[PDB]
Design a protein around this ligand. Structure first.
Ligand SMILES: Nc1ncnc2c1ncn2[C@@H]1O[C@H](COP(=O)(O)OP(=O)(O)O)[C@@H](O)[C@H]1O
Ligand SMILES: [Mg+2]
Ligand SMILES: [Mg+2]
Length: 203
């Protein structure tokens, strides 16, 4: 009763709902993400792999006490690791681990912490890959954190999404197999849909 509302910051419950929301959002794009998948092999599963990663994070959030930020961060990291499938799922789970690490010790997610979490998430994903390649989900995730600017949550999500979409468009310029197939990177495209889902929850 005595805890007011933060206009541009998410409490632990809102952070959990945001990832549940983005998981429900993601399902419409799975078939497209599968068909984009050419790197490292064209086996049509990037969307399915990333969705299984997000759904496992959602199941853990449903089991956790989402009134404590540290509990939301634990479920996000632990759930995405177990559900991770394929290269995109493992990388995504490690991005989410760095995201969750930024939330630890904090009581609310504002624009400043969202920028920090997106940047730490990208660093965590880059450190976890043994041999990173550019033009990929790592390039897109790094750009989203670097371009995340502003103090209000809506502006940070908007600028991060715009930076991610710009990096996504340039992935064929960096990775020849994408150019030859005439596609953008499926993993990077999946991360854009994740950021889009987060913007949809905040809007
Ligand atoms: N070494 C790497 N560096 C950066 N990103 C990578 C690397 N390997 C794979 N990826 C990402 O994984 C995506 C493919 O994921 P997915 O289809 O699940 O992989 P697979 O089916 O080969 O296990 C790629 O589009 C790319 O974004
Ligand atoms: Mg694949
Ligand atoms: Mg595969």
């Amino acid at each position: 009763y005595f805890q007011g509302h933060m206009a541009e910051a998410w409490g632990p419950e809102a952070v959990a709902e945001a990832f549940r929301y983005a998981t429900r959002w993601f399902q419409v794009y799975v078939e497209e993400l599968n068909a984009l998948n050419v790197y490292p092999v064209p086996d049509g599963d990037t969307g399915t792999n990333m969705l299984h990663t997000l759904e496992a994070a959602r199941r853990e959030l449903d089991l956790a006490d989402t009134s404590r930020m540290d509990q939301v961060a634990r479920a996000l990291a632990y759930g995405s690791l177990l559900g991770a499938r394929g290269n995109s799922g493992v990388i995504l789970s490690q991005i989410l681990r760095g995201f969750a690490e930024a939330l630890k010790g904090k009581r609310a997610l504002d624009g400043s912490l969202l920028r920090r979490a997106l940047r730490m998430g990208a660093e965590s994903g880059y450190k976890a890959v043994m041999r990173p390649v550019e033009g990929t989900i790592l390039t897109v995730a790094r750009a989203a954190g670097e371009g995340a600017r502003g103090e209000a949550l809506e502006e940070v999500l908007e600028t991060a999404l715009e930076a991610a979409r710009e990096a996504l468009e340039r992935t064929p310029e960096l990775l020849p197999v994408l150019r030859q197939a005439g596609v953008v990177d499926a993993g990077g495209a999946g991360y854009v849909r994740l950021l889009e889902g987060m913007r949809g929850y905040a809007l």
